[PDB]
Amino acid sequence: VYEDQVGKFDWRQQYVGKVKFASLEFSPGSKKLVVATEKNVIAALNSRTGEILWRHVDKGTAEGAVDAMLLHGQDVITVSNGGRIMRSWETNIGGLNWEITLDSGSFQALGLVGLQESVRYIAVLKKT
Amino acid sequence: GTVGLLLEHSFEIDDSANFRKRGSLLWNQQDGTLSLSQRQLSEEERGRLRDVAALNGLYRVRIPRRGGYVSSFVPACSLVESHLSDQLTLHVDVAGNVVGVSVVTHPGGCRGHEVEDVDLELFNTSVQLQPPTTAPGPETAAFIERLEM
Amino acid sequence: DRFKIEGRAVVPGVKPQDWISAARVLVDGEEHVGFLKTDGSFVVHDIPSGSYVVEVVSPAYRFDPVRVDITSKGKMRARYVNYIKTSEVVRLPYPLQMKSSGPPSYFIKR
Amino acid sequence: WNTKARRNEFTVLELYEGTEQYNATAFSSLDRPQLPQVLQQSYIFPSSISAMEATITERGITSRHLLIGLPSGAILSLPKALLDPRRPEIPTEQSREENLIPYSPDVQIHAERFINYNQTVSRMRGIYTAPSGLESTCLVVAYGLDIYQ
Numbered sequence: 326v327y328e329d330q331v332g333k334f335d336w337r338q339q340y341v342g343k344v345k346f347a348s349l350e351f352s353p354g355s356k357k358l359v360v361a362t363e364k365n366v367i368a369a370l371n372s373r374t375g376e377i378l379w380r381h382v383d384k385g386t387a388e389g390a391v392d393a394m395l396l397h398g399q400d401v402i403t404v405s406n407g408g409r410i411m412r413s414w415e416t417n418i419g420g421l422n423w424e425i426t427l428d429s430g431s432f433q434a435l436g437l438v439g440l441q442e443s444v445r446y447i448a449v450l451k452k453t
Numbered sequence: 454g455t456v457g458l459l460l461e462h463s464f465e466i467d468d469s470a471n472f473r474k475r476g477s478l479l480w481n482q483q484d485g486t487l488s489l490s491q492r493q494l495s496e497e498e499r500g501r502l503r504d505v506a507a508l509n510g511l512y513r514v515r516i517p518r519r520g521g522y523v524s525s526f527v528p529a530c531s532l533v534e535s536h537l538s539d540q541l542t543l544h545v546d547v548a549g550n551v552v553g554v555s556v557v558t559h560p561g562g563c564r565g566h567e568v569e570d571v572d573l574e575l576f577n578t579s580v581q582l583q584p585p586t587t588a589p590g591p592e593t594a595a596f597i598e599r600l601e602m
Numbered sequence: 603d604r605f606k607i608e609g610r611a612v613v614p615g616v617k618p619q620d621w622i623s624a625a626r627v628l629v630d631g632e633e634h635v636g637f638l639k640t641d642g643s644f645v646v647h648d649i650p651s652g653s654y655v656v657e658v659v660s661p662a663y664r665f666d667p668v669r670v671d672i673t674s675k676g677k678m679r680a681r682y683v684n685y686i687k688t689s690e691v692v693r694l695p696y697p698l699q700m701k702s703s704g705p706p707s708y709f710i711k712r
Numbered sequence: 713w714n715t716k717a718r719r720n721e722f723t724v725l726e727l728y729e730g731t732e733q734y735n736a737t738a739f740s741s742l743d744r745p746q747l748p749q750v751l752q753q754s755y756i757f758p759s760s761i762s763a764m765e766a767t768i769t770e771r772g773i774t775s776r777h778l779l780i781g782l783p784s785g786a787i788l789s790l791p792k793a794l795l796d797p798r799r800p801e802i803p804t805e806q807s808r809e810e811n812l813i814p815y816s817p818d819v820q821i822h823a824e825r826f827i828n829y830n831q832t833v834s835r836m837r838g839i840y841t842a843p844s845g846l847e848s849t850c851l852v853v854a855y856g857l858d859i860y861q
C-alpha cells in the first residue's frame with residue numbers, strides 16, 4: 326500500500342544552518358555553490374534551481390566545527406574541530422578526496438604556498 | 454548510631470506561622486528501627502484542634518533535616534471526623550540522606566459526624582522506613598535455557 | 603591513547619561513486635561518525651578503548667552491523683553482533699568487508 | 713544504557729490497583745490512602761533512541777503506538793502490547809488462552825514497520841503528534857535539521 330501512495334499526503338523540506346564560509350568560485354559554474362555552516366553541516370546549493378546536491382553532517386554537540394575553508398579549481402579543503410582532523414571534498418561528485426591527521430595544537434591560520442608554478446603545499450600554523 | 458529527629462506540628466485558623474515541639478523520634482540507621490515518643494495534648498490544644506477542624510484548615514508537619522526543612526500538609530477534618538490515626542513515612546536515599554516525609558490517614562473520609570472528648574486523648578501513630586528498591590534486569594539466562602530445552 | 607579503524611564496503615553492482623553519495627558510517631550512533639571515500643572506505647580516528655558496533659547507514663542498500671573489540675595493546679577482534687549471547691561466535695579478519703544484500707523492503711505488498 | 717554489558721535496556725513501569733474500586737465519582741489526592749502496585753519488565757533495544765513520543769488521540773479508543781527515532785533518520789512505531797508488564801515467564805494455560813505471547817527479551821527492528829521509506833531526517837531533535845478528528849489518525853511531524861510530516 327505504501328508503494329502505491331508514494332507522496333499523496335506527505336512532505337519533507339530540507340534546511341541548512343546559517344551560512345558561515347561560502348565561496349562563489351568555479352569560473353565554469355554550471356550549478357555548483359558550496360556552503361559550510363556553523364552546525365557542522367556542509368551543503369551544495371544550485372545556482373539555477375536551488376536544491377541540495379550533496380550534504381554532509383558529522384557533529385554538533387561541541388566538536389567538529391569548521392574553522393577555515395580553501396577552494397581550488399575543482400576541489401575544496403576544510404579543517405574541522407580545532408586542528409586535529411582535516412579532510413578534502415570534491416564538487417563534481419561528493420565524497421572524500423583525502424584525509425590527514427594533525428598534531429596537538431591550537432588552530433590559528435592556514436594558507437597556500439606555491440613553489441614556482443602553482444600551489445603544491447598548504448601551510449598550517451598552530452600556536453607553537 | 455542512634456539519631457533523634459525533631460517533629461513539629463502546626464495549628465492556626467487559616468494561615469500557618471507557629472510551630473511547636475510535639476515529640477522526639479529515634480532512628481537507628483544500621484538496624485532500621487524507628488521509634489516515636491510524643492507528649493499528650495492539653496484541653497486548650499484539643500479545643501483549638503476541634504475549632505480548626507470545623508474551619509477545614511490544614512495540618513502542616515515540620516521535620517528539620519541536618520540544613521533542610523521538610524513540610525507536609527494533611528486535612529485535619531478527616532482526622533477529627535474519624536479516630537486519630539496518622540501514619541508517618543521517612544524517605545531516604547541509598548546513603549544517609551533524607552528526602553522527606555508524608556502523613557497518611559487510613560479513613561480518609563469527608564462525612565464528618567461528630568468527635569467526642571474521649572476520642573482525642575491518645576496519639577495513634579506508626580513510623581515506617583522506605584529505602585530505595587532495586588529494579589530487576591533482563592532475565593536472558595532463563596530464556597537461553599528455555600530455548601535450549 | 604587513540605586508535606583508528608579502516609574498512610572497505612563493496613556493492614553488488616551499479617557504481618561505487620553513485621552509492622557514495624549520502625553515505626556515512628556510525629561507530630556508536632551519535633558519538634563517532636565516519637565518512638566514505640571516493641570508491642569506498644571508512645577511516646575513523648580519535649577513538650578510545652572499548653568495543654563498538656560499526657554500521658554503514660544508507661537509505662539505499664543497507665549493511666549488517668559488525669562488532670569490533672579494541673584492546674589497549676593494539677589487538678583488533680571482529681565478531682558478529684550478539685545481544686542474547688556474549689561469547690565468541692566466529693572470528694573474521696580485521697579488514698572489514700561488508701557485502702550489502704540489496705534494497706531493504708520498505709513497503710508492504712497486497 | 714548499561715556499562716557492564718554494552719547494551720541498552722528497556723524498562724517499562726506500570727501502576728495497577730486492586731480488584732475493588734474506590735469512590736470513583738470524584739478523584740482527589742487528599743483522600744485515597746492506598747499504594748498502587750508497580751510492575752517492571754526489561755527488554756533489549758539495539759539502537760540509541762534519540763527521540764521518543766506516544767500517539768495521543770481525542771477519545772482514546774484506538775491502539776497506543778510508541779514512535780521512536782533512530783540515528784539513521786527512520787522513525788519506527790511499535791505497539792505498547794509487546795512491551796507489557798503482564799508477560800508471564802513460563803507459558804501458562806489461561807494467559808495463553810486469553811491474549812498473550814511468551815516473554816522473550818529480544819526486539820528486532822522490522823523494515824516493514826518503517827514510516828520513513830525514503831525521506832530521512834539527519835538530526836532527530838523531536839517529534840510532535842497531533843490528534844486528528846476522524847478517529848484513528850494522528851499527524852506526526854518530525855523537526856530538527858529538516859521538517860517532515
Ligand SMILES: *[C@@H]1O[C@H](CO)[C@@H](O[C@@H]2O[C@H](CO)[C@@H](O[C@@H]3O[C@H](CO)[C@@H](O)[C@H](O)[C@@H]3O)[C@H](O)[C@H]2NC(C)=O)[C@H](O)[C@H]1NC(C)=O
Nearest residue numbers: 535536537538539540559560572573575576577578579580
Ligand atoms: C491504632 O493504630 C493501630 C495500627 O495502625 C490500629 O490497628 C488497626 O485497626 C484497624 C481497624 O481498627 C484494622 O483494620 C482491619 O483490617 C483488616 C484487614 O487487615 C480488616 O479485615 C478489618 O475489617 C479491619 O478493617 C487494622 O488491621 C489494625 N492494624 C494495623 C492497621 O496495623 C488501631 O485500631 C488504632 N486504634 C485506634 C483507637 O484507632
Ligand SMILES: *[C@@H]1O[C@H](CO)[C@@H](O[C@@H]2O[C@H](CO)[C@@H](O[C@@H]3O[C@H](CO)[C@@H](O)[C@H](O)[C@@H]3O)[C@H](O)[C@H]2NC(C)=O)[C@H](O)[C@H]1NC(C)=O
Nearest residue numbers: 560561562563564565733734735736737738739740743744
Ligand atoms: C464520593 O465523592 C463525592 C464528591 O466528593 C461525594 O459526594 C459529595 O458528598 C458530600 C458530603 O456528603 C456532599 O456535601 C453535602 O453538602 C450539603 C450542602 O450542599 C450538606 O448539607 C451535606 O451534609 C453534605 O455535606 C456533596 O454534596 C456530595 N456531592 C455530590 C455531587 O453528590 C460522595 O459522598 C463520596 N462518596 C464516598 C462513598 O466517599
Ligand SMILES: *[C@@H]1O[C@H](CO)[C@@H](O[C@@H]2O[C@H](CO)[C@@H](O[C@@H]3O[C@H](CO)[C@@H](O)[C@H](O)[C@@H]3O)[C@H](O)[C@H]2NC(C)=O)[C@H](O)[C@H]1NC(C)=O
Nearest residue numbers: 327328329331332661662705706707708709828829830831
Ligand atoms: C527513493 O527515491 C528515489 C529517487 O531519489 C527513487 O528512484 C526513483 O523513483 C521514482 C518513483 O518513486 C521513479 O519515477 C518513475 O519514472 C518512470 C519513468 O522513468 C515512471 O514511468 C514511473 O511512473 C515513476 O514515475 C524514478 O525513475 C526513480 N529513479 C531511479 C534513478 O531509480 C526510489 O525508487 C525511491 N525508493 C523507493 C521508492 O523504495
